[PDB]
Amino acid sequence: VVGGTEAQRNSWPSQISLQYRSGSSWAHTCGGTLIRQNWVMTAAHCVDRELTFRVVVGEHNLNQNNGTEQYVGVQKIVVHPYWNTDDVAAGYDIALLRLAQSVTLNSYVQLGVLPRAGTILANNSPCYITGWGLTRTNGQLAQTLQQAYLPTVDYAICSSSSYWGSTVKNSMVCAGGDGVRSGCQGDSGGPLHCLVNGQYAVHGVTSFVSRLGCNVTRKPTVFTRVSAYISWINNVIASN
Ligand SMILES: [Ca+2]
Numbered sequence: 381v382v383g384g385t386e387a388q389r390n391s392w393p394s395q396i397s398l399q400y401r402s403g404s405s406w407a408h409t410c411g412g413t414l415i416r417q418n419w420v421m422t423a424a425h426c427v428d429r430e431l432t433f434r435v436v437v438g439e440h441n442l443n444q445n446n447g448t449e450q451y452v453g454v455q456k457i458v459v460h461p462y463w464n465t466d467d468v469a470a471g472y473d474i475a476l477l478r479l480a481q482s483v484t485l486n487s488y489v490q491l492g493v494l495p496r497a498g499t500i501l502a503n504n505s506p507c508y509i510t511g512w513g514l515t516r517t518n519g520q521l522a523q524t525l526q527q528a529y530l531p532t533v534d535y536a537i538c539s540s541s542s543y544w545g546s547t548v549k550n551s552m553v554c555a556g557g558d559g560v561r562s563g564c565q566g567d568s569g570g571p572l573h574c575l576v577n578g579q580y581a582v583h584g585v586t587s588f589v590s591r592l593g594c595n596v597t598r599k600p601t602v603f604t605r606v607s608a609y610i611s612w613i614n615n616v617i618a619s620n
Contacts, residue, residue, distance in 0.1 A: 383561035394492030411570020422569035503534035513566030559577035559597030
């Protein structure tokens, strides 16, 4: 997250760190959202790589023991059937990971609330992006969770020519684009938390940023619209 501030520890308890084994160590590669005690929601581009992955829940500082972490392996990865690695602009950047064990819920570990199917937010809706991704374009990962206030940019504006044009589809959410704050690499797959009826719900899964850089004016961070996938999500969890 570019232009963020440090999140307090129990602020966003459904946020997970998706990591892969690198030699003898594990590196954070993407964010995710805990949606069931044994199911995490993330972007399908984060699991394109056949690597060994684990999920870290109740995490705050990646380089230090917080005393709250739970470490779990990934037992099954279910990527959206239409996801195409060579076309992220086509959408379908969503994946579900079945965890090897059920995690324990406590104040640091909670389930993310999903929106009702087909819900579309009004332009300029108050949302926050959270993650340990790069803090500057071509910079380094954050050590502690960062958060940035990133209001939505509706479809008509986001798909206009000054913004993203045709790259953005109606199955996506745009947020930010002020040239100061944004999602960045390493934030992918993580949540876009939006306040709806007094509750924060996860309306987006971080998908992409501009090729030109993370924080670029008129190039909001683009998210997979979670409300477009509620039936798919439920059909996967019910049969696996
Ligand atoms: Ca830690």
